[PDB]
Amino acid sequence: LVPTVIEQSGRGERAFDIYSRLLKERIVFLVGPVTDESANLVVAQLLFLESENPDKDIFFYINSPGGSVTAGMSIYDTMNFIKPDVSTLCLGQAASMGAFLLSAGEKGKRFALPNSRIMIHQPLIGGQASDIEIHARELLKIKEKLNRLMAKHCDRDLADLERDTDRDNFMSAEEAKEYGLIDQILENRAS
Amino acid sequence: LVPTVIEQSGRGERAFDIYSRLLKERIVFLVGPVTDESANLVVAQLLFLESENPDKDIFFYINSPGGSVTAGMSIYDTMNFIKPDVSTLCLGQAASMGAFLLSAGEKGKRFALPNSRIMIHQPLISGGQASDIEIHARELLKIKEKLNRLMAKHCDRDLADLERDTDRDNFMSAEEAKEYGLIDQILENRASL
Amino acid sequence: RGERAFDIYSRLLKERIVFLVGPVTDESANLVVAQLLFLESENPDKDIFFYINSPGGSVTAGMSIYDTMNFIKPDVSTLCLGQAASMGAFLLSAGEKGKRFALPNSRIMIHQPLISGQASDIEIHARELLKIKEKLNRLMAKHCDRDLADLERDTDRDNFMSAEEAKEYGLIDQILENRAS
Amino acid sequence: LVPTVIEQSGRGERAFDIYSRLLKERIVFLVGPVTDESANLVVAQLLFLESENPDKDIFFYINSPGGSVTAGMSIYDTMNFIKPDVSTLCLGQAASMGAFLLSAGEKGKRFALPNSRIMIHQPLISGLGGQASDIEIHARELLKIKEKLNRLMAKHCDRDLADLERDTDRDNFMSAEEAKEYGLIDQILENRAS
Amino acid sequence: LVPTVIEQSGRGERAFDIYSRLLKERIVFLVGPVTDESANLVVAQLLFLESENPDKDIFFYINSPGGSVTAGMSIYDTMNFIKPDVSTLCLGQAASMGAFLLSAGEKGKRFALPNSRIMIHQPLISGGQASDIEIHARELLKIKEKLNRLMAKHCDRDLADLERDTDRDNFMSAEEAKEYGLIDQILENRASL
Amino acid sequence: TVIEQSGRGERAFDIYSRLLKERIVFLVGPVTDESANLVVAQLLFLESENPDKDIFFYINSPGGSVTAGMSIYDTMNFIKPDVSTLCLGQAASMGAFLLSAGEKGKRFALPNSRIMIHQPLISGGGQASDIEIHARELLKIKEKLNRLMAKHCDRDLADLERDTDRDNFMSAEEAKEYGLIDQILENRAS
Amino acid sequence: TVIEQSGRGERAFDIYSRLLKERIVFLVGPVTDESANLVVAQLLFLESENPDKDIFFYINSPGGSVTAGMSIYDTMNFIKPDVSTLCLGQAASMGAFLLSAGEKGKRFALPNSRIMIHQPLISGGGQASDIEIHARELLKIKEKLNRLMAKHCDRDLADLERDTDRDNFMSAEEAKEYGLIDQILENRAS
Amino acid sequence: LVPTVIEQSGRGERAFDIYSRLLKERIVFLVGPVTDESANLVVAQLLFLESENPDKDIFFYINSPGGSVTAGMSIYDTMNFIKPDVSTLCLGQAASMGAFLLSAGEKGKRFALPNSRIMIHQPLISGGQASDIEIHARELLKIKEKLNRLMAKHCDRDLADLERDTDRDNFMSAEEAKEYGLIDQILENRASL
Amino acid sequence: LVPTVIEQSGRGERAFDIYSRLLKERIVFLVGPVTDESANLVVAQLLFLESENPDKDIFFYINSPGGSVTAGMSIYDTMNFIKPDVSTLCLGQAASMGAFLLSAGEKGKRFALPNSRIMIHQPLISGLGGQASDIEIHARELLKIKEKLNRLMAKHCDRDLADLERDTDRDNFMSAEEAKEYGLIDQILENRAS
């Protein structure tokens, strides 16, 4: 991957890779599987944007199939912690932890482009039976928490999310807006 | 891959790699399979040239066999969203999603070089419980129809046409693509156009 | 005989005992069928004892055994030892009603079909899969004297049953302990 | 593994592979891991000996580290279902399911050799997979299996279910004496003079 | 991994990668499994920050499932040695050696975000003569005791509590970790923080 | 064990079944559950044909599974017949243990046999609790082995503990002096 | 060693080059020809900038190549500057050897450091002549190591021969008592 | 390998595989590398032949490149123990432990075919602590000496000749092997034989 | 392998990777196996330092187990061709071709550190292939190479060709003292006070 290099200005024309250039406009990308490294990269940029300007919105572009719940949560908690409104934008796809982060942007500022693919579902995955029990119970707790938090993000009842996440649930952008998972569908420079 | 490094002038004088220099003239490449990384890098480039001048045409060069529909859609929506005209130029080939994005350039500004190759076809895959197999089957049906209608839109044809002409691989010459409505012009050389 | 099994298994075939052990393949399923045909040939009236210890396997291989059980004249008594799951449970439930048995600590499990190109081909195969799912549910409901609706409900996900719960469900008739007719 | 061949004479001299000779004396072996295949070969031999004579003892030699639970239960129920007493005898080791089967022999006729090794422990799984609903189903099922085994073991040893819960929580090695003691086996054989 | 690049002003405009820019403000990360080199990288960052200012707190963000205990002990001892208080912050998860380090922060400055996951448990080894194995078992016993004791003090609990509660994987919410004495406060947002 | 050849007596036998007909039993190569139980089966069968006739047990083994070895050992001791043991090529580790286990006075080696003894040796477990459990068990096994071999050799336990701390190679003479075997064979001249 | 971060001083440095500017040198992970020679290069460079200022050498290593270790060792001894040694996490085998090699009085450990010493240990050669050659060489190395560590610890050679026959784990206190290190650090309060 | 089957007559017609039929006439083969099981198979054949007739010679055909020395010592000691003289015949080759066994035949009845190849050399090992390696080197030295001594007697030469001449691979023709004292006679055909 | 970076100040402060800093002091390193690539990097550094100053000593640190013969000869001839003296210094180990290069330094300036390891031995090949005519060609060639090396080594050590033939027949380990003794190196350095 050679990222193209770009020139700015503001007394002294500086060069930087195109993603650092887009960081200056407060755009952060979640592309691909959510890992500790990729999620912490997102945290790092969210903290930096907050200290650059705690009053300006941050635009979080999500094109992700999901991944680590724990790494997803670290992105989650950072979005909610910092002063800026984290506005989310689905591009290409937002599934699993991807959809959870997308739906976690500031209400009123969660967007999808028209042909986005959103998907939600319950969690997905040795030792002695004691260790199996412990991990099974923990996994039930994660599912229950993910459903409660997503019921809240979508302004829906818990019962609705248990049912609609029992198996893979694909939604068009329109079906996502309808569900409460996003607010607006972006088509082109107009809104 | 060593990208040759190159020089530019104009009260000041800097040196980028050849792709960053070409990006300065608003040329963007899609080469090989569209993955998440390669699609998002096209998106980043589109967002940038818009910001740099939301009114100048962008020149989207495509040489691709396709790849992820989801990564490719993220290019399509960006292309449509941003203000400037995304002109498309097929060189080498545009197959599956590559042809889809080719057909998605601003009508009147979709081009091919004289020996480009275009190909279009229905989606093809490479699961577990019967309930889950069924959810993913109905979803692959929806994607197939969606892709057909979006292709009918770009091509000014019926959905029935694209249903028929994508049921199996459908190769097109540059002339055949233009007649299909997939592209607009066939650039031969500099002199003419 | 012998037939890639043992002399012990040949001796027990003489006492009309047929084993299904392990996964159901084309190979292991046809050997059951072959034994079944053979035993009907040696006496089309005496019962066959079909011992099942299997997590299941290929549905079409299973159906070959099922249709052979139903076609031959002798009543095929089924007996679960160890486990009978998926296609294995299906075959167990398919024994002659009144002669479907289980040892006290057998594991029984039933569920919907589990699986391993072009969208057109996916559509064709997905539809065949649903027809499969429905046919097994109907047949299993008939085996169990229950409502099609109950089977669809109780096989959405893996459903483990002890011997007692299989008896109650309608999947077997008797739990065998020692010697008590 | 070539098995040696052997003559039984008198009113007709016949030849057997040695293990077939030992089956004729109602001796059955479980050796190595318990799989569906090797367990069902035990079941089949138990059925044959009952068929030949439903009243004589059967002697079940066990040298095994354990293996499949369902496969082992198929031996277990077959032991209890058939009329003959199945005497069990540990040589080398009776581990996990192998010790479950050793302790399942007819009370009074569960034996070990002086330097046998016995070990009991709760179930262990290799690994997991699907959705949380499925992982809940399999965990709930595995906990049922763990109680079934503890409860059966307790009966065999004449102990509280709690006793076997505690003493299987981790690997639990026993000498032959410690196993007699625990109620796993009845007698420790030293030689034939006994 | 492409770390984004960032510019700061003040008597001179300079460029940093984002993690160096965050280091500039006394923030250090332990992300992923604890290895010798990832551990020593944390140590070097603490040595540097103490030299820049031995009296300002250091903010130690932890998102890790654990790792080598010796490597984790190099961080631990470096945290206790340096004059600056090391505040610990759990984001994502802090498990095993990551839980240890999280709890090892300066009492009063150990936090977790609301959905952090903490887990603690006994050592756990992956992969000669009985004499050799005897020696290593004895050593492992000593390590297991020492980790329990150190963590008992971190938690202001008895040793026998930590031995009991680390026999198997012990998962905790942020709130359960606050009760146990493993963190001090849950951070919700810029509440009062 | 390519093709095992056949000989005649009045019936036909493979040569190993023939040697078994004369109460010769082989332990060759590593001691596995299956090779050890084949030795157990032969010993059980030989006892029943003649509970009083000696059994001759050839050992060419580098050893192997402790539990597998123990099963031959307890069988040797259990059965009425004396089990003579005869080392050719090598008896090392559990091989040497079984060689020493032969009926005392009837433990032999050939002049260039190689004998070797040592403490238990393991390849490469999980939680520390499990590690301590298995470590304690491995040491019980070490101590148990030293005590039986001390008893086989009529020697101090501390002697065998000192002499198996590391690999200890013994010639046939050395094993005789040690108490591990009784005589060294050569020729029929005996 | 993901991205090594940058700090400022008046120029920009990666953080390890920054620590080197203050005569701190790290040995981390296994001792290879390349990691050992990088330590050699740092030590040579530090001497030339100031032949009299102490050098501080952090050791978190499980050890590694003997010849690689020796090259750090002879360099430490050769150069004018005192090389202080500081163990964090672990110094085992050649790691512990180098820790002990620090200028006497200037060998430190952190309170939970783990130290470990033992005899030379080899994975797994050709003709017997070559085997005897390499076996004799391995023993010369064992003896040489025991004697230098005896000298580093001010102890009998026979002491170190007895105490490295098998893996010997030492706490920081134990290593101090043994003579392997001098002080145990904690706090700046020192 | 399909061993051909063969019938013999005499008070009764029976069928043997060819190697069993050749065993019937006191012929045993060592073909290929010497392993524990191929060695023990030779031992069992010698035990059987001595019992069939302890006074008729045994003909031991050897075509082997060597193998385990312990396994080869089981044959060696069995050959010296049994009353029948074991005549050795080298066909193809006899190398290392195969050379040893060839030379170990009863003096006067060790032969080679005209184009047999003999080779002798020092032991040669394929593939813990210095203490352990010390012990094993010492043992290997003792084995190398013992093999040299035994072979020196087989050859009626001094020990120091065999040590010298086995330092590296020492190839010999049948005739050179006859001179060295490793065989007695070269068989050409049914000359006088 | 991150190499640290370093400041050289005075009339302008510059930054180098440390190894580049050490090259400026005419220090060259051969570390690890001798391959065509790492040898030619040595040759290139020898050419550069002669270019910068053809009269100052060059100091060649060697920590290497050996490697390619032709690659090592490329260093050897370049050492002798260039005007500067190339002083050699063993640290860690100078084995096979590494000890050939150590002994090839300018007489008087071949040094070792107290605990260095030196070892010399005849060539060894990995492996063979073609027709017997080719195997004869390569064997005849390898024997030429073996004599070339022994003969050169003898010159370096002031010994008979026969001496080095004998003492390379099998692996031959030397302490630093034994190597000074043998004539491989001149002085054993202990510290800077010397």
Ligand SMILES: CC(C)(C(=O)NCCSc1ccccc1C(F)(F)F)P(=O)(c1ccc(C(F)(F)F)cn1)c1ccc(C(F)(F)F)cn1
């Ligand atoms: C760690 C803490 C210092 C921090 O990250 N500052 C932001 C550093 S970036 C920066 C700042 C200024 C100038 C330039 C830069 C940049 F970027 F250019 F380098 P903090 O502010 C914090 C904690 C948690 C999170 C979140 F979102 F991850 F959860 C977010 N921020 C903080 C403050 C107080 C406390 C107390 F007192 F409660 F302990 C704890 N933590």
Ligand SMILES: CC(C)(C(=O)NCCSc1ccccc1C(F)(F)F)P(=O)(c1ccc(C(F)(F)F)cn1)c1ccc(C(F)(F)F)cn1
């Ligand atoms: C996110 C949004 C700021 C954005 O992408 N800017 C990218 C322009 S970068 C830039 C800008 C100025 C100067 C320099 C630079 C550069 F390039 F050097 F960094 P936006 O303009 C947008 C949305 C979607 C897409 C597409 F095409 F991908 F879909 C494209 N652009 C936008 C505006 C308003 C809202 C509202 F109203 F919903 F909040 C939402 N989104």
Ligand SMILES: CC(C)(C(=O)NCCSc1ccccc1C(F)(F)F)P(=O)(c1ccc(C(F)(F)F)cn1)c1ccc(C(F)(F)F)cn1
């Ligand atoms: C897209 C088009 C601007 C283009 O790629 N320019 C690339 C040159 S960048 C440049 C320019 C000036 C100074 C510096 C630079 C640089 F590089 F240093 F920064 P175009 O010129 C074109 C099309 C096809 C091909 C070929 F050869 F690949 F086939 C080639 N060029 C073009 C496209 C369409 C039309 C139409 F259809 F509207 F007539 C007319 N022209």
Ligand SMILES: CC(C)(C(=O)NCCSc1ccccc1C(F)(F)F)P(=O)(c1ccc(C(F)(F)F)cn1)c1ccc(C(F)(F)F)cn1
């Ligand atoms: C094939 C068929 C002849 C058949 O199996 N014979 C076996 C008779 S054994 C026998 C008899 C005497 C002596 C020894 C033996 C033995 F066995 F010891 F050697 P069939 O009876 C049949 C079909 C399908 C199935 C099942 F179970 F798979 F469903 C079962 N049986 C049959 C009859 C008529 C037709 C018609 F009418 F269509 F022409 C078609 N098929």
Ligand SMILES: CC(C)(C(=O)NCCSc1ccccc1C(F)(F)F)P(=O)(c1ccc(C(F)(F)F)cn1)c1ccc(C(F)(F)F)cn1
């Ligand atoms: C080795 C010691 C010099 C050291 O690490 N300095 C590193 C500080 S970097 C620095 C400093 C100033 C300016 C710029 C920089 C920078 F950042 F730009 F490079 P020290 O301070 C030490 C030891 C251990 C630890 C810890 F945390 F690992 F435990 C921590 N520090 C020390 C002090 C006293 C003694 C005594 F008393 F025993 F002699 C020995 N060692």
Ligand SMILES: CC(C)(C(=O)NCCSc1ccccc1C(F)(F)F)P(=O)(c1ccc(C(F)(F)F)cn1)c1ccc(C(F)(F)F)cn1
């Ligand atoms: C089980 C017992 C019958 C048994 O295995 N015989 C095996 C010999 S087969 C045989 C027998 C006769 C004729 C032919 C054959 C053959 F070989 F041709 F088939 P047993 O004699 C016994 C126990 C333990 C061991 C040993 F060595 F493995 F430890 C050995 N033998 C025995 C006797 C009494 C009791 C009591 F009274 F305590 F219950 C229990 N066990």
Ligand SMILES: CC(C)(C(=O)NCCSc1ccccc1C(F)(F)F)P(=O)(c1ccc(C(F)(F)F)cn1)c1ccc(C(F)(F)F)cn1
């Ligand atoms: C070769 C010798 C010049 C050398 O390596 N200096 C390395 C220091 S580089 C340097 C120097 C000055 C300024 C800047 C730099 C730097 F770092 F920025 F580049 P030397 O000092 C030596 C030998 C051995 C070792 C050790 F520790 F590895 F064993 C160490 N140093 C030396 C001196 C005298 C003799 C004599 F007289 F006997 F020939 C031989 N060798």
Ligand SMILES: CC(C)(C(=O)NCCSc1ccccc1C(F)(F)F)P(=O)(c1ccc(C(F)(F)F)cn1)c1ccc(C(F)(F)F)cn1
């Ligand atoms: C063990 C001993 C019975 C033995 O091997 N018989 C095997 C001969 S098979 C046989 C025999 C007769 C009829 C039929 C058969 C056959 F073939 F059909 F089965 P033995 O004769 C012996 C020991 C060692 C070796 C050798 F060559 F390996 F060294 C060789 N033979 C023996 C003799 C004396 C003593 C004493 F004196 F110490 F008690 C101990 N052992």
